Write a protein that binds this ligand. Structure first.
Ligand SMILES: O=C(O)/C=C/c1ccc(O)c(O)c1
Length: 360
């Protein structure tokens, strides 16, 4: 088994609540390379509905039925963890499209495109300090994503002089967070960090304001699309939100390596879907292909697509190829840094009169 095409399996969430993340990821595939080194790319896209069991099945199908050289996904963290388990057992390179906890068992075959939590937390906690915030409450998912954030707030947050005074959790599918909001408003912190994503991110935003909270609200990069503003409406005003720089390529210097790729994606996306349809999420799948454009030609020098040797050559190329410019950042993976990002990979956003504005 050795082939002319390079086979890429993608599992993303295009049904259910997390479709707010996976649909732009799928849509961005219209604008990525169709061939690398003259080899056509065979891209198989499967929905997982956000479910780790479905993601596990899809990922294994890509290995066994499709003989994939690279697997990508998923849209949210629990199925992403599942994909990483399969990829590490099968020895297939995996580009994660949601943040996930890198452990030793996942590090060999997995890299991640979204900004790591600590890089995003740093920009949020610094703004807190600069705005005279001393006490902070947290509301987030009762799963690995909500844990990543809470654990960072506690470690980074306390170390630069923030006090956590309240912690509440909710489940992704929950339609109400009334109970949690009552306890947060009762604690009355200066600021609240919401550890959520997509549509669910807007539920604490609206409930907190409707319940009369008047402190600062901070949101994570999981919330970084126009849909958050659509859902939260006036309650989104003054929110502070971590995002990738693809949200504002126009505001970047021509010397930013992120600028040309951001403009390429946004011009394509917004030509089809309209002004200000850009998102954090479209950029991740687009950027995964930018990485492949760098690493696949290296692997082609020494190995045939469809072979374990090719999979191994991609794995080694991910670490040997430095400074891969993409829309969301400049990636330099190492054997221990599976995200490969630095300060060029984030900006801080606020919302003013219903639009995103960069906090300068
Ligand atoms: O819901 C989650 O599990 C996290 C989702 C998430 C968070 C940050 C990103 O950049 C992204 O594409 C997805």
């Amino acid at each position: 088994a050795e082939t002319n095409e390079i086979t890429i399996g993608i599992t993303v969430t295009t049904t259910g609540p997390a479709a707010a993340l996976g649909i732009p990821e799928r849509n961005a595939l219209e604008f990525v390379a169709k061939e690398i080194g003259g080899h056509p790319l065979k891209v198989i896209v499967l929905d997982d509905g956000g479910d780790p069991t479905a993601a596990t099945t899809n990922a294994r199908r890509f290995v066994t039925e499709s003989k994939a050289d690279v697997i990508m996904g998923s849209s949210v963290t629990p199925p992403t963890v599942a994909v990483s388990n399969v990829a590490n057992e099968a020895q297939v390179p995996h580009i994660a499209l949601a943040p996930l906890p890198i452990t030793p068992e996942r590090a060999k075959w997995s890299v991640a495109m979204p900004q790591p939590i600590p890089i995003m937390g740093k920009v949020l906690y610094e703004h807190m300090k600069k705005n005279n915030i001393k006490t902070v409450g947290y509301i987030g998912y009762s799963d690995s994503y909500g844990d990543l954030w809470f654990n960072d707030l506690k470690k980074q947050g306390e170390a630069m002089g923030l006090k956590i005074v309240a912690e509440e959790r909710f489940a992704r599918p929950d339609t109400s967070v009334a109970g949690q909001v009552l306890k947060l408003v009762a604690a009355n912190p200066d600021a609240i960090l919401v550890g959520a994503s997509g549509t669910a991110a807007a539920l604490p935003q609206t409930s907190l304001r409707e319940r009369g909270y008047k402190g600062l609200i901070y949101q994570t990069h999981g919330a970084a699309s126009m849909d958050f503003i659509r859902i939260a409406g006036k309650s989104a005003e003054g929110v502070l939100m971590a995002s990738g720089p693809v949200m504002d390529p126009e505001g970047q210097d021509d010397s930013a390596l992120t600028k040309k790729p951001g403009l390429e994606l946004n011009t394509a996306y917004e030509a089809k879907y309209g002004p200000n349809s850009r998102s954090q999420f479209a950029a991740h799948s687009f950027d995964a292909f930018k990485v492949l454009e760098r690493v696949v030609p290296v692997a082609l020098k020494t190995a045939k697509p469809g072979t374990q040797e090719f999979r191994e050559a991609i794995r080694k190329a991910l670490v040997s190829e430095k400074d891969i410019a993409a829309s969301q950042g400049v990636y330099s993976f190492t054997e221990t840094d599976r995200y490969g990002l630095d300060d060029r990979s984030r900006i801080l956003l606020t919302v003013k009169d219903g639009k995103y504005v960069m906090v300068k």
